[PDB]
Amino acid sequence: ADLAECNIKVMCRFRPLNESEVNRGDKYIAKFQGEDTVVIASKPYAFDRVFQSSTSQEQVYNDCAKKIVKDVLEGYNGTIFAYGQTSSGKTHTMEGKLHDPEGMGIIPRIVQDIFNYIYSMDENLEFHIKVSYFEIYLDKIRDLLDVSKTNLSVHEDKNRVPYVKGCTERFVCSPDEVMDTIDEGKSNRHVAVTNMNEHSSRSHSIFLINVKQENTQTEQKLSGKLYLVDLAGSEKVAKNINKSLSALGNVISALAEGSTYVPYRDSKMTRILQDSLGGNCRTTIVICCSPSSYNESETKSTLLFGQRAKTIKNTVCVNVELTAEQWKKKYEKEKE
């Protein structure tokens, strides 16, 4: 009818072994079945989809993000975030070779698709797309489009949904504008960072696409937020090196158990993704793993996080906006 309940989608992507791993006695320990199951230590883990090391960027996008883009275009909130220990393949998955047609990742592909669609519709559909690009490090938000603001606050919008107050919101009209924006952010992130390899492994990168469209015929306004997240490393020290990752794990556990209380507040990361996790949003998590034997423990660890998240259910619905005028017309036609 109106709204529907849906599970969080969880895709597991293994990457091929790197030079480093090959040089040691590292052996490929992932055994594949069908295309939804992977075996590690004579144990099966079934997901919505399992991607082998040979799976191309393009394949991942089609099986994972293309659908999200379609929902967002329909007025749905969607989220996609990569999860896994450092070097498992999160950035490669979400970003890839930003401008390489064959090597680019989910984000740049989603950007092209959004505009391909728009350029297809008639003039009756008017889209207003603004983007934001910030990062969360040590529980503090920095705007990648304006690095001078380094500790932005999370507030609630008019519809009581979490949002980074005061973060840059660029209005874009073409893919190119979004790409330049993304290049601008990648670049500023280096400022005041004394070691990008370590920094990025320990920080959260969030790219937000706010899509608002209005139909002149139907007189309806739809709006959907699209979070594309490149989480910090899930590896442990005894416990998660990233407290924010401990939070994400607790939130995921609470939801998966059906507990009335969910610790979203433990970190602003989990507060920003509050709607993505248990709310009005179509979320897809891509857990990234190393097929390496040297990494077997972190992998099982990652596979479990995926198995829990998979059991969570959201109650989503299109996000329509009506004026008091439009609202009453319908109210009357219904109050009949």
Ligand X SMILES: Nc1ncnc2c1ncn2[C@@H]1O[C@H](COP(=O)(O)OP(=O)(O)O)[C@@H](O)[C@H]1O
Which amino acids are annotated as binding site for ATP, given as ranges?
A: 84-91
- Minimum distance of ligand X from residue 271's CB (angstroms): 23
Which of the ranges 21-29, 82-90, 119-127, 261-269 carries the binding residues for ligand X, by CB under 6 A? 82-90
- Residues in 156-215 that interact with ligand X by CB under 6 A: 201
Interaction mask 272-311, ligand X, x per CB under 6 A: ----------------x-----------------------
Q: Where do the H-state alpha helices sit in the chain?
A: 19-23, 57-72, 90-94, 106-118, 175-188, 196-201, 243-257, 268-272, 274-278, 296-310, 324-335
Torsion of CA 318, 324, 327, 332, to 10 degrees: 170
- Minimum distance of ligand X from residue 292's CB (angstroms): 11
113-146: b or e for each residue (b if 16 or more CB lie within 10 Å)?
A: bbbeebeeeeeebebebebbbbbbbeeebbbbbb
CA distance 122 to 222: 16
By a kind-dependent CB cut-off of 5 to 8 A, residue 84 interacts, out of ligand X, Mg ion, none, with: ligand X
- Binding-site residues, in ranges, read 84-91
Q: Which two tokens stand for residue 230?
A: 């490149």
Tell me: does residue 91 bind Mg ion (CB under 5 A): yes
- The DSSP annotation for 188-227 comes to HTTTT-S-HHHHHHTSEEEEEEEEEEEETTTTEEEEEEEE
Tell me: does residue 221 bind ligand X (CB under 6 A): no
Interaction mask 88-127, ligand X, x per CB under 6 A: xxxxx-----------------------------------
- Closest-by-Cβ residue to Mg ion is 91
Which is nearer to ligand X, 87 or 210 (by Cβ)? 87
Provide the CB-side half-sphere exposure for 238 (13 A, CA): 0
**Burial class (CB within 10 angstroms; exposed 0-12, middle 13-18, buried 19+) of 215:** middle
In the chain, how long is the greatest CA-to-CA distance? Answer: 75
Provide the CB-side half-sphere exposure for 183 (13 A, CA): 9
Tell me: does residue 234 bind Mg ion (CB under 5 A): no
- Contact residue for ligand X among 11, 30, 83, 87 (CB under 6 A): 87
- Closest-by-Cβ residue to ligand X is 89
Which is nearer to ligand X, 64 or 255 (by Cβ)? 64
Which is nearer to ligand X, 126 or 198 (by Cβ)? 198
CA 155 to chain CA centroid, Å, is: 20
Interaction mask 49-88, Mg ion, x per CB under 5 A: ----------------------------------------
Nearest alpha-carbon partner for 162 in 263, 325, 271: 271
Tell me: does residue 225 bind ligand X (CB under 6 A): no
Q: Residue 132, SS3?
A: strand
Tell me: does residue 244 bind ligand X (CB under 6 A): no
Q: Residue 336, SS3?
A: coil
- Contact residue for ligand X among 77, 86, 132, 246 (CB under 6 A): 86
- Minimum distance of Mg ion from residue 201's CB (angstroms): 6
Q: Residue 44, SS3?
A: strand
Residues 326, 330, 335: CA angle, nearest 5 degrees: 145
Instruction: Find out whether 85 and 235 touch, Cβ atoms under 8 Å.
Output: yes
Which is nearer to ligand X, 15 or 225 (by Cβ)? 15
Which is nearer to Mg ion, 203 or 274 (by Cβ)? 203
Tell me: does residue 242 bind ligand X (CB under 6 A): no
Which of the ranges 15-23, 127-135, 178-186, 302-310 carries the binding residues for ligand X, by CB under 6 A? 15-23
Which residues bind to Mg ion, rule: CB under 5 A?
Answer: 91, 200
Q: Which residues contact ligand X (rule: CB under 6 A)?
A: 15-16, 18, 84, 86-92, 201, 288
